[PDB]
Design a protein around this ligand. Structure first.
Ligand SMILES: [Mn+2]
Ligand SMILES: [Mn+2]
Lengths: 250, 268, 249, 245, 241, 263
């Protein structure tokens, strides 16, 4: 019920596993997992893995790989071809599942190859991981968001990814087929908009229409960029560039 | 040559044809032809026809017909079912031609029954011109009238009231290949009438299935922000899932600079 | 007097002159003069003249010429070279005087050539107008601005140029020398700004700095154009393109 | 039927009355009546009356009287004391009645004294002592405009005029000072480029109603409006988020 | 003047007091104090108290009480009835004084009851030890992070009495009405906001730099504050202050 | 390669020098250098030098000096008379060089008298830029600044007031005070990043383009205020602050041709 007992449960489970592979996103959860694993098992018994794929930006991958090295961990990139699975490529509502199944499947192959006893992720108390058998040790020790921040301060952890990102599949309607070209064009559009000073942004894909979602409090500030955004996204392949009057997550 | 002769040749053609049916749009050109026909032939010798259809607003039709009654013509309304022609219902790039063909066909059938010698229009292809195939005569075109000569002579005859903004068929708000229905046509026109009621007379609601794409003059987009939320829910209640505003505005590219206008033209 | 007497005095003056040339700007004063001339002497005895020059836009020139033709007049354009006079080219406070000297001179020559007895303008109740023998008939009949609009409504006149036009010299400080290139630079800049939906606009010239004056109530509407205006006006030759926070004048 | 029929009915009605007094506000409706009255009967059979009062602006009064002479009428101004009636000074919901009663009473006395057969006002489609010939001829807002261009009328007051009583809550007493306070505020707002505006009076709070399409253009004036209306006596100067009406 | 000398000055003062009761707001100042007392004196000698009242938001109360447990302290909520004092209920210009009188009296009682030597608060440049150690806004951030502090309440609040004119009677309903209005405005993306109460008129103060960003919310803010009971919803052209 | 190696090479270079004088601006680069020198060499082997001149605001000087002693360094102020040099006083295009030569000359003199082996500055990828020798980029500076708990630094990059005057215009106390009073007023309204370029009777305000919409509510007071400081016209540059950096690919290249038109 106290953070000390919850931290005791986490140290004991890690001592039990002896050698672990950690699915590392750069967030505060996996940062806490990978830092506790290094402290109890040592650097040669922990492998931090960062997933690289089309569905996430090449820049966020670089960020996660540096944060793992800053913790003092051996970090390893693995490249996933999500588009090879037809459920992910045709963006059915179960795409989230086959993406997560192919992710944990690759984590088990490297953990088999490195002699680890488990795959660890950063899920707390607030379907594919349990199918493959990954362990959420923070969830098993009854960590909540407050306990993660509490133990992170106890250990001196201050640096992590404060915004967590979503799969780029969210910018496509169900049934639309994802290609190498329309994924890349959606991400260039969002990287350009972020470059203008709009960190929270979405470019929803509707074939020849780009549908830009912004926080409504920023749309007044956005007017001075209308024409540059319009022609920049047309040079990326959109025929029409539009702004959704509903705002962010209409 | 000079305006006195151009009006003289126009009167000579009208005197020769003796009884005419005039395609009347409410514009200044068709207002000038029908009033000159009245002055030369008198009321029982001229029939003004105003076309009603789903492709144009109920407000334009009521207005064009009142403006013809105000000039003193015997006026007749006709309703055209443009959607019966598959070129118009499937919005082919040439559906403008098949629209005008069905229009002049109905006008010629009206002119056959009222005993007029010609159909006159207010003019200042996949085959033969819709006029030349139907027998219609553009008498201002045979008299070499220009936009100013129409305006010059329209005052000379005391003409003051006409439809000044001109219209565009509602088919222009749909992409080529999209099928026009009674429900989605009503949907765009309700959307544009609501936007107009907010104070934006020049507006377009382009139909993109579940996306509505609003074109406004870019100079009004700053003024438009206070209506964003009401516009979005109003057009969602009209059936659109997403309501969006095109960042190029109305007539994308006409108000850009030399280099960036050439870039906006290359992308099309 | 009453507006009936003032129109009676105006018709008698025109009837006596029999053949006339009218300097036509498109404004309500010259429109009322040229329509009274058409009605009293007929289209064949009245010639409307519209001045074209480097100091005024081709767009204001085109409007006056359609309007004169739309009133049922035979209208003729003339191009004036104001910059040949150095009083205009070095932009002294008497520049408008020497400009008007050259304007009425060309008008006098047209009236000799077509057999007119006087040149008429639309000035109501000045030094250069007199030395050329020009007649201001609305002023001779004691027309005021209220008499001008009153008779303009009696004649069914509804369409005229509402924006009096200013010579481009006002966009340069006193003493700055006007050239063909910097005159062309200001007018291209202003033609572009007006095309965006700002009819009331000025681009003040400060060598490499352009200073845009807009009505303060329109500055919010302008924000969406910042980037295109800035690059268009640099391609016209300005190094810096700026917006005056004081607004128009 | 057609505007020609509507104009004929109005011409025949005017010929029947022979002598008329016209209540002239300067708007397009009364401008169209007063010019038709002049056009059918001539300057000497028509009397244009312009009401001066504390409930309407001095700028509107001067404009209508100048517009009447420019239309060719003999025009005369009559002053009304709306605040002398206790129903108007205490701003009851029935204040309109006693204002209209007082207004038409004064017009009837001017028309009796000059021998006119009726008092005419500029009321259209959508008061016994006054005839509304445009409403009797079934003129609509569109038909008024239509015939106004047919006659070359271009100059009138383009924004509808409303009594200043609407800027005070029902039950508030009207004074010379608070009326002057609202009017100075609305006159200043109009000078910045907002013809349609209201300054609702709430004692120490001013509540400005603008057309919602103009509120974005208004931001550049926030600061100057806030100090001008404070020097007129408001402690708080505010902008109503509902807009005009 | 070295953050090391200032923290040493602070560590020395805490050791002298032994047992302490800390007035905890959830801000970085009171967060830096409450942890520093725990680090030098231990959990069993430090009690963090978080005040509950109608003059401050339920969210600020709930947030500070969790954030203090997250620091590893024994935390205790106390409820204050500020409206029981007639100066506070009638919102007199000196009512700020009587409000702080009830606050520090209740803390002092608590500190007497648990055997603490002083009540400490988080006031920078009762005992303000951060103020006695010459901490500045920047010295607090440097040392907080030093111990690993990242989580606190950055939006410092003010008593809701400031939204009512002097002499206006505070009720439970109009206090609830102003705070519902401000929570809605904050949720749209305007953290600094005031809804001044003028009976049937709401007068919104926003930072003038945000008024342009605010325009798109005019209509729903207008209908939202009316459904809360205002007849007129307005925006003050002078802005915040 | 790895941030640890870059911090490792940085620790090795500092250990060899033994005593250093640090040119301290208050920015993140020199703040990271000055702490790292303290951590390897101690308070008695590091002297932080902060330059005060007429060309920078009294406020950035005050902030830099508090940040140097607050990091635990013994810091000393040095005052440079940049306006005594004619290249700077007449603002020739090479003024920056003569400013930096006069700056580094005084730093060499202080390091001679306190027995330091080198003067260190904060320039990244006889002064030595240890961050540049350790292959630090903007990204490695921010990462290692977070690794050491450094939170406070001069966040809005600071620049010489000479940049607000055209080349050839002579700087005076009256026109410098005029530019800095104008810029200090704009900052108080909520625009930390701002430039008021001087053009004789014209002030030309550059703002980040993302703030220009927010600026409209201040148009008139900014106009009145800067006229009372001596400007006849107060204008807003439509290209904004650092024009071109946030435009599209074609527009950024055109504005770069326009910028290279002048020299
Ligand atoms: Mn903003
Ligand atoms: Mn506007």
């Amino acid at each position: 019920a106290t953070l000390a007992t919850k931290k005791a449960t986490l140290v004991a489970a890690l001592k039990d596993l002896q050698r672990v592979t950690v699915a590392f996103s750069g967030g505060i959860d996996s940062t806490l997992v990978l830092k506790m694993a290094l402290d109890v098992l040592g650097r040669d018994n922990v492998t931090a893995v960062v997933a690289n794929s089309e569905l996430f930006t090449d820049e966020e991958f670089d960020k996660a790989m540096s944060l793992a090295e800053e913790l003092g961990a051996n970090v390893q990139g693995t490249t996933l071809d999500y588009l090879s699975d037809d459920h992910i490529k045709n963006n059915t509502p179960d795409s989230w599942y086959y993406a997560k199944k192919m992710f944990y499947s690759r984590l088990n192959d490297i953990a088999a190859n490195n002699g680890s006893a488990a795959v660890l992720d950063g899920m707390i108390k607030n379907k594919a991981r349990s199918e493959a058998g990954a362990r959420s040790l923070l969830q098993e020790a009854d960590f909540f968001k407050t306990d993660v921040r509490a133990l992170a301060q106890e250990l001196g952890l201050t640096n992590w990814n404060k915004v967590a990102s979503c799969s780029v599949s969210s910018r496509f309607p169900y049934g639309t087929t994802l290609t190498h070209d329309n994924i890349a064009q959606v991400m260039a559009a969002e990287k350009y908009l972020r470059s203008l000073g709009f960190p929270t942004v979405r470019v929803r894909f509707h074939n020849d229409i780009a549908r830009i979602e912004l926080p409504e409090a920023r749309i007044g500030d956005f007017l001075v960029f209308n024409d540059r955004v319009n022609r920049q996204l047309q040079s990326l392949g959109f025929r029409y560039v539009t702004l959704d009057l509903g705002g962010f997550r209409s």
